[PDB]
Amino acid sequence: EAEAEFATPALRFVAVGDWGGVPNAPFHTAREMANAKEIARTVQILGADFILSLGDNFYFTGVQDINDKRFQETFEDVFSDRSLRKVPWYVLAGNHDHLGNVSAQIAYSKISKRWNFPSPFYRLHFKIPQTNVSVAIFMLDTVTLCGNSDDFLSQQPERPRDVKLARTQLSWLKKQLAAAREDYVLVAGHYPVWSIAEHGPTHCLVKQLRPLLATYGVTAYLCGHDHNLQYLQDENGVGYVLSGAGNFMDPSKRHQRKVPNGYLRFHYGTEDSLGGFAYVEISSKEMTVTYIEASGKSLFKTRLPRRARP
Numbered sequence: 405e406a407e408a409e410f411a412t413p414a415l416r417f418v419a420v421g422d423w424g425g426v427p428n429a430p431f432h433t434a435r436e437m438a439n440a441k442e443i444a445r446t447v448q449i450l451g452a453d454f455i456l457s458l459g460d461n462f463y464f465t466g467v468q469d470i471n472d473k474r475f476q477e478t479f480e481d482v483f484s485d486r487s488l489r490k491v492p493w494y495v496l497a498g499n500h501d502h503l504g505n506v507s508a509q510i511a512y513s514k515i516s517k518r519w520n521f522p523s524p525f526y527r528l529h530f531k532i533p534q535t536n537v538s539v540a541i542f543m544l545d546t547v548t549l550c551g552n553s554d555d556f557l558s559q560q561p562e563r564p565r566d567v568k569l570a571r572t573q574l575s576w577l578k579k580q581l582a583a584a585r586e587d588y589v590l591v592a593g594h595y596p597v598w599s600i601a602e603h604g605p606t607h608c609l610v611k612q613l614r615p616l617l618a619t620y621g622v623t624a625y626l627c628g629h630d631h632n633l634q635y636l637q638d639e640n641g642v643g644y645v646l647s648g649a650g651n652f653m654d655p656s657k658r659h660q661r662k663v664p665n666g667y668l669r670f671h672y673g674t675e676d677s678l679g680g681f682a683y684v685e686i687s688s689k690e691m692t693v694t695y696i697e698a699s700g701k702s703l704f705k706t707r708l709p710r711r712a713r714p
């Protein structure tokens with residue numbers, strides 16, 4: 405019957421990176437606040453089961469301890485609209501967070517109900533509600549894997565501080581990807597695999613992480629670190645969602661030529677913009693990704709079919 409209304413079930417989330425305000429009063433920017441507002445509107449119109457932070461949570465040197473007012477001034481008070489208050493955040497660290505006390509950002513999980521950061525790297529598991537279809541997300545700490553970009557003049561992480569700790573995270577990720585039975589597998593980290601902008605591809609991730617994405621049928625890798633919005637897709641059908649425009653916009657196309665031809669499907673970096681983020685919908689059929697500006701405009705939309713997995 406025409407009047408019978410059945411919704412397509414979907415898991416829905418916002419992916420926002422590099423939103424961490426500024427280290428001087430009032431500890432936030434016009435861009436951070438504009439994005440907090442458009443994120444709230446997006447949750448209230450389209451819905452969201454959670455928010456994923458892609459690192460650089462507090463600029464410029466993270467936090468000192470669990471009592472640092474930055475938690476209040478840059479996070480709690482900014483993302484304060486009532487449509488957001490109970491929506492959980494699942495968080496990982498970026499380079500700027502490792503310049504401070506990262507353990508304090510893990511511990512803050514015990515104080516704020518909505519802040520979830522149980523360890524430097526971890527696995528999340530979700531069902532698409534009202535179905536049997538499941539999604540895994542692996543949250544990586546790319547600083548301990550590759551090094552901190554701020555230690556090098558190139559701003560390219562050239563070596564990890566502790567090689568055995570790096571190797572442990574990579575071995576963990578291999579064991580997990582190999583054993584994952586979920587219908588969709590996503591991996592997230594602060595640093596990019598591919599990006600055409602100011603930092604560009606992270607060589608450590610192109611060498612060590614990229615091979616695993618194809619081997620184990622990962623749908624997408626999500627990241628920030630470059631302060632813009634990009635969508636890329638490789639020959640194996642793996643998507644690269646870059647969303648690091650929660651606070652800054654950088655128009656650099658400096659590494660355009662370091663990315664293989666065909667990969668870039670979308671880039672938005674104009675420095676007039678107030679930034680943006682990405683909204684992801686996962687249904688039984690496909691994963692949809694919409695990039696949304698803080699003005700409210702839809703910039704770009706693409707789909708990733710569900711694939712059978714080994």
Ligand SMILES: *[C@@H]1O[C@H](CO)[C@@H](O)[C@H](O)[C@H]1NC(C)=O
Nearest residue numbers: 468469470471505507508511
């Ligand atoms: C890091 O933060 C935790 C939680 O507040 C605190 O217990 C610890 O003393 C801090 N470490 C440093 C280096 O201050």
Ligand SMILES: [Fe+3]
Nearest residue numbers: 422460629630
């Ligand atoms: Fe950043």
Ligand SMILES: [Fe+3]
Nearest residue numbers: 460498499629
């Ligand atoms: Fe960064």
